[PDB]
Amino acid sequence: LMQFTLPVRLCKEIELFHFDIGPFENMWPGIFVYMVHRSCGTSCFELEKLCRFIMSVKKNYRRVPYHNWKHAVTVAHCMYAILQNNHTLFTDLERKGLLIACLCHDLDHRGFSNSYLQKFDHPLAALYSTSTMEQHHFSQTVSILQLEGHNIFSTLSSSEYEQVLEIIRKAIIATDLALYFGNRKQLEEMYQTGSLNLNNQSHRDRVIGLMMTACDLCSVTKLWPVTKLTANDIYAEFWAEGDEMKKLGIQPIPMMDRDKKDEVPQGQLGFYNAVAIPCYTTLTQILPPTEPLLKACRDNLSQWEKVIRGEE
Numbered sequence: 497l498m499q500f501t502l503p504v505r506l507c508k509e510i511e512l513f514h515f516d517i518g519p520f521e522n523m524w525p526g527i528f529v530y531m532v533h534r535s536c537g538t539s540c541f542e543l544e545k546l547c548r549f550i551m552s553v554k555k556n557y558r559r560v561p562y563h564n565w566k567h568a569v570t571v572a573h574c575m576y577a578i579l580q581n582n583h584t585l586f587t588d589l590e591r592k593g594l595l596i597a598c599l600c601h602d603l604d605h606r607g608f609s610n611s612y613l614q615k616f617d618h619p620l621a622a623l624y625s626t627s628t629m630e631q632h633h634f635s636q637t638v639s640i641l642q643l644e645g646h647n648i649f650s651t652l653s654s655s656e657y658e659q660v661l662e663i664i665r666k667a668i669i670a671t672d673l674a675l676y677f678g679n680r681k682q683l684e685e686m687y688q689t690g691s692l693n694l695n696n697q698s699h700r701d702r703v704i705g706l707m708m709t710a711c712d713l714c715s716v717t718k719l720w721p722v723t724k725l726t727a728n729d730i731y732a733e734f735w736a737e738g739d740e741m742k743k744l745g746i747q748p749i750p751m752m753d754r755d756k757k758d759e760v761p762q763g764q765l766g767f768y769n770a771v772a773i774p775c776y777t778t779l780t781q782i783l784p785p786t787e788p789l790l791k792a793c794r795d796n797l798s799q800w801e802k803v804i805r806g807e808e
């Protein structure tokens with residue numbers, strides 16, 4: 497009979513897409529659990545295992561500016577918001593899997609891109625030739641599942657356990673933004689030729705793909721002061737990578753060069769047009785109730801336009 501309840505402001509704001517989880521680390525575990533209980537059920541996961549699993553995941557995120565424990569809970573909230581606004585479209589198994597897939601999706605991120613692992617010649621690039629970090633994140637997810645007392649899916653049948661771990665795997669892989677562009681193009685066509693069908697599992701995998709890129713990017717769907725201060729977190733990682741690239745004797749792309757701070761507004765603009773806006777556009781078309789994400793993304797587009805004209 498043991499539910500989590502949140503202060504009134506949070507209980508009410510958490511159901512909105514633009515919810516920010518705030519600066520009190522110690523609340524994020526309760527917030528996550530609250531989300532699982534409302535989205536999935538009180539029964540979905542034995543609470544002793546869920547808590548112990550949540551705390552091992554936290555322990556395995558590093559202290560990097562952006563790809564941190566706070567990013568993990570943020571992405572899981574965006575997924576919660578999608579699943580609560582589309583509650584008949586998804587299986588019991590997808591609801592379980594995706595919230596766990598989102599929390600785990602950047603486990604053990606070092607704050608370096610797949611490109612920097614390859615050019616450094618890091619061991620993980622030898623183990624995994626594409627989607628290097630993403631396959632590492634899935635690997636660490638299995639690791640923490642197999643720690644004693646941590647199997648939150650112990651109740652699942654052999655088949656169900658295999659189906660969910662597959663959902664999680666494809667979910668995490670999809671957060672590889674290099675795979676997104678093609679995934680959205682195919683989902684664009686299928687919808688517009690009327691061929692998109694959610695009883696086709698290969699089609700459901702694509703939709704979940706896009707969902708995962710939507711949640712992963714949801715910093716651009718927040719209030720402007722949250723979007724603005726998150727863009728500082730992202731650029732600090734990128735400028736640290738460019739420094740490292742320089743140390744290998746390679747000019748980094750301008751995105752990653754700190755001597756090119758000033759072209760950031762123009763950079764975030766490019767990003768909204770080429771990635772975020774298409775992502776949230778195609779997602780709205782497929783799942784109409786996700787519109788707020790597109791509305792909020794457009795508002796922040798317009799706020800970067802305004803920075804460029806030195807109106808702020």
Ligand SMILES: Cc1cc(C2CC2)nc2nc(CCc3nc(-c4ccccc4)cn3C)nn12
Nearest residue numbers: 713714715716730750751756759760763764767
């Ligand atoms: C992968 C990713 C995730 C998110 C998450 C927060 C939502 N935001 C993001 N912003 C950027 C970075 C965009 C970006 N800056 C530039 C740039 C910057 C300065 C000088 C020159 C060029 C190019 N380009 C594409 N990547 N990115």
Ligand SMILES: [Mg+2]
Nearest residue numbers: 601602671672
């Ligand atoms: Mg990632």
Ligand SMILES: [Zn+2]
Nearest residue numbers: 601602671712
């Ligand atoms: Zn991420």
